[model samples]
Target chain A: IPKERLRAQTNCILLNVLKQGDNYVYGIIKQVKEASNGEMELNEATLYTIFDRLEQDGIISSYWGDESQGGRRKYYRLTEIGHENMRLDIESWSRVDKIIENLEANKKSE
Target chain B: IPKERLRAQTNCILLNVLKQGDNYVYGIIKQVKEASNGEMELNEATLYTIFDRLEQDGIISSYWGDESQGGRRKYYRLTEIGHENMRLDIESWSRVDKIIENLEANKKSE
Candidate 1:
């Protein structure tokens, strides 16, 4: 597994978003909306706050769009280590994920 | 609680070492060795690596050896927040762990 960093707030969620594709704040908002079945939503303001933190922590990098994908929006992408740590966090959390799924299965029968 | 930087074995062991008292690397080796009645012994290299991690993760903090403690060696101590999470991990794991433990009991005994 990849190593951990000092800060890990939303490490998995944000990284998972970037893993799918490089996107801007609005794009992220859209993906997260659909991803959570519309249960979770965040404004552009907070997304920038999170993106700023992740960028400072080296989990993400940002660049302005151009030519093929160019636009006024600043796009964000996961760094190499970001992908590794995100996978690790997801894998580690998967154990708890299993526990919850099992409990749910026992709770609400299909 | 710091999420699943959780290696329960080493997590409890190392935290309990500082849980006993703040100490340096050599002291930890001695503490674990004696605490386990010599069953396990960890060297400086491994302790250093683990300390580096826990320190970075905010679970532990470090400082120079003061007059009361070691003359010049660095001492490490557990953070209060980390202990709260530590207890949480113990609480979370112990229930499920015992559940599985009882499962084994049913398999073997009755």
Candidate 2:
């Protein structure tokens, strides 16, 4: 998929990862960057900005994880509101995906 | 424009109105609702949440608007970074519009 395929893909990815289990914000960023084929769509600034926004809005909550590796890692987890937003975002994305597929097929048919 | 047409229309609307001179947040909200044909996409909470986020990021700065009406209205305005973001966003939106127009024309040609 092209970049446009996932314009707000970073938000969805971060929400999903945070929703699945507890992880540090950096960890989430690394995972998403890997998944999106190293797409730097969410630069450091944008990622942090979104994180700050989500946290301020009470959509996601964060805590310092137990020092398993060596030092405490600040972990972020999605709240109920965050999960609900993710669900809505997923549905919205799926709808767009369907449109893209249909239109691509339509073009080929001609 | 359909609701989909202005998916992030609220952000753009809020940003644009705020960019022009200064006005209270509620005033900006009312103008956007009227302009978008009363597209009640952003409810009270979402508006405030976005306002909070933008403020936290220093992308927007807000102050109490003069009590010209009857109450102290919080006025939010975009900062330099916010204007830079708006420029990029406009370019991105224009790209999408071009694609949509091309596709629609393609469909009509058949």
Candidate 3:
């Protein structure tokens, strides 16, 4: 996948993860890796940029955890609009997948 | 999809098209649109950039067609390496498609 396309996918995946539950940056990274079955290993820097962009778009929000208990983790949670956006994104991507599936099946048949 | 990510896909798609047969720019564009089921419509500028990149990488070669019969058309043909690269690209993208399929199915089940 092209990097930017992968980044767009990361956006949807991260938002969906946050929809399931609030998570810190590291935890989200772990889920993303697991979701992609180890094919995608996102570095922190890129994840941070994505996080920043999502927050700016009001799709997600971040808050710093209390430091006294343990290492402070910045947690992210999806907003209402974010949830809606994820639904739409999934639908759109599903269409894309259908096209690819047809392309693959047609190729095989040929 | 993000523009750059789409561009990367364009590279694979164009190469695969050329693998099937040599084509002029307009012909390639038409095939790409049809292949993607109209989900992807590539503009000429981006296609030209990708064509240049692929040519510079030696994945494809281009030459002028007869001008006396009609307007001179620049035809592109895939090189041996381009064919091999298309094979590799299909394998890699197949993996991606599998991941997305699983993701969609899981979401539906949930």
Candidate 4:
């Protein structure tokens, strides 16, 4: 099967957007949408579903946003653990990319 | 809760090695061990356990390897379905990468 990068990126995007500050749930959705330049391509329902998965994994949490923003939107934030995981993921990707690069270079030389 | 590339690499390595054609279980292991510069860091027991998972997923199947080499090693090969899934995975990864790479280049510019 073709390996996928989207799942990893979507996870990373969520982490990166949250790192910008605590965001109301829709704020998060908007942040990702804007940050990815509309490339992330997720619908609100599916976005919330992914949020549910991350919450289940204990990587994120939800609380009531300041009740001022036209009724309380659910605020979400990354846990410390999520940051650690994100760092490790980025590191691993770099490592593998290096290996793959060397292989391509070597193949071209041959 | 590290987002593990090891997990993803192991899966990709298995699929890539199998693409070289059917291999005895150990042969597949050796191919990954060799191709990745012994960097993947998985032990034999763990490798077989992943094999079990791949089998469960129907991504691969095993049959008795050429019985000529003493006790036959179980040879495994990718299914058509596995290749389709792999293509999707790879496609997904590239889409995400473009978004991320652009972000990084922009962040650096800023």
Residue A38, candidate 4: C-alpha displacement in angstroms: 6.4
DockQ order of candidates, top first: 4, 3, 1, 2
Q: What residue pairs are clashing in model 1?
A: A65-A70, A66-A70
Better of 1 and 4 by TM-score: 4
In candidate 3, position B100 carries an lDDT of: 58
Which model is ahead, 1 or 2, in terms of TM-score?
1
Q: Reference contacts recovered by each candidate, as fractions?
A: 0.00, 0.00, 0.11, 0.18
TM-score of predicted chain A against the true chain A, for each candidate: 0.67, 0.64, 0.72, 0.76
Candidate 3 local lDDT, A10-80, one digit each (tens): 66566666766788878877766766888788789988888898899888888987798877678888888
Model 4 captures what fraction of native contacts?
0.18
As a whole number from 0 to 100, the lDDT of residue A92 in candidate 4 is 74
lDDT of 4 by residue, B24-89 (tens): 756655555555788765577877888898889888888876667577567788988788887887
Two-chain complex of model 4, DockQ on C-alpha atoms against the true structure: 0.24
TM-score of each: 0.42, 0.40, 0.58, 0.69
Report the lDDT of model 2 for residue A48. 76
Q: Ten residues in a row with the worst lDDT in model 3 chain B?
A: B1-10
iRMS, model 1 (angstroms) = 17.4
Candidate 2 chain B lowest-lDDT run of ten? B98-107
The CAPRI category of model 4 is acceptable
Sliding window of 10 residues with minimal summed lDDT for model 4 chain A: A1-10
Q: Candidate 1: deviation at residue B12, Å?
A: 2.1
User: What is the per-residue lDDT of model 1 for residues A1-110, given as tens digits with 9 covering 90 to 100?
Assistant: 11222123334455666766688887777666655546447677777877898798788999988757454768899998787776675575555444334433433442
Please identify model 3 stretches exceeding 4 Å from their true place.
Answer: A1-16, A32-46, A57-59, A65-71, A79-110, B1-16, B32-46, B57-59, B66-71, B79-110
